[PDB]
Amino acid sequence: KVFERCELARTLKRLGMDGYRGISLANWMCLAKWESGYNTRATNYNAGDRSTDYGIFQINSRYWCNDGKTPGAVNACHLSCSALLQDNIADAVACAKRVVRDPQGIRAWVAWRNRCQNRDVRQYVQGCGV
């Protein structure tokens, strides 16, 4: 499913993402926007290293979920990468919380550095009641 902006913001808030390890809801929103356009079903294959990015946060198979076909990979979220393509994003949010428990936090995603870091991200949550 492709979330509407404010619908997603409220969905993430209910799931405990607001301020999780220091990360505001607007930063999570900016991440989802630029990674996937708020799209849970998106996959993107990285020909360079044979990994794939999954779902609304485009979480990578090399480190975070198992898809069986990424060489040398581990599965730190202990999930099939299939779980990251559901309309319900509970598992994707649990896995995003796992990513940012590591030292880099939200810097783990390069698109966040490019598109969100050091920017005014208030617009992503404007009017959403969050």
Summarize the SSE layout with pairings.
Elements: H1 5-14, H2 25-36, E1 43-46, E2 51-54, E3 59-60, H3 90-99, H4 110-115
Antiparallel strand pairs: 1-2, 2-3
Helix pairs in contact: 1-2
Active site: 35, 53
Catalytic activity: Hydrolysis of (1->4)-beta-linkages between N-acetylmuramic acid and N-acetyl-D-glucosamine residues in a peptidoglycan and between N-acetyl-D-glucosamine residues in chitodextrins
Function: Lysozymes have primarily a bacteriolytic function; those in tissues and body fluids are associated with the monocyte-macrophage system and enhance the activity of immunoagents.
Account of the protein in words:
It is classed as hydrolase. Helix content is 29%, strand content 8%. The chain is an alpha+beta fold. It has a single domain (1-130), classed as Lysozyme, CATH 1.10.530. The chain starts with a helix and ends in a 15-residue tail after the last helix.
Record keyword descriptors for this entry.
3-stranded antiparallel beta sheet; 3 strands; 130 residues; 4 helices; Lysozyme; alpha+beta
Briefly characterize the structure:
29% of the residues lie in helices and 8% in strands. The chain has one domain (1-130): Lysozyme (Orthogonal Bundle), CATH 1.10.530.
Order of helices and strands: HHEEEHH
Number of helical segments? 4
Q: What's the shape?
A: globular
Structural class: alpha+beta
Distance between the termini: 21 Å
Strand order of the largest sheet: 1-2-3
Number of separate structural domains? 1
- Major sheet size, sense and barrel closure: 3 strands, antiparallel
In the CATH hierarchy, the third-tier topology is known as: Lysozyme
User: Helix content range of the residues, please?
Assistant: 25-40%
CATH architecture heading: Orthogonal Bundle
CATH top level label = Mainly Alpha
Q: β content, as a range?
A: 5-15%
Question: How many DSSP E strands?
Answer: 3
Rg of Cα set = 14 Å
Catalytic activity: Hydrolysis of (1->4)-beta-linkages between N-acetylmuramic acid and N-acetyl-D-glucosamine residues in a peptidoglycan and between N-acetyl-D-glucosamine residues in chitodextrins
Family: Belongs to the glycosyl hydrolase 22 family.
Active site: 35, 53
Domain C-type lysozyme: 1-130
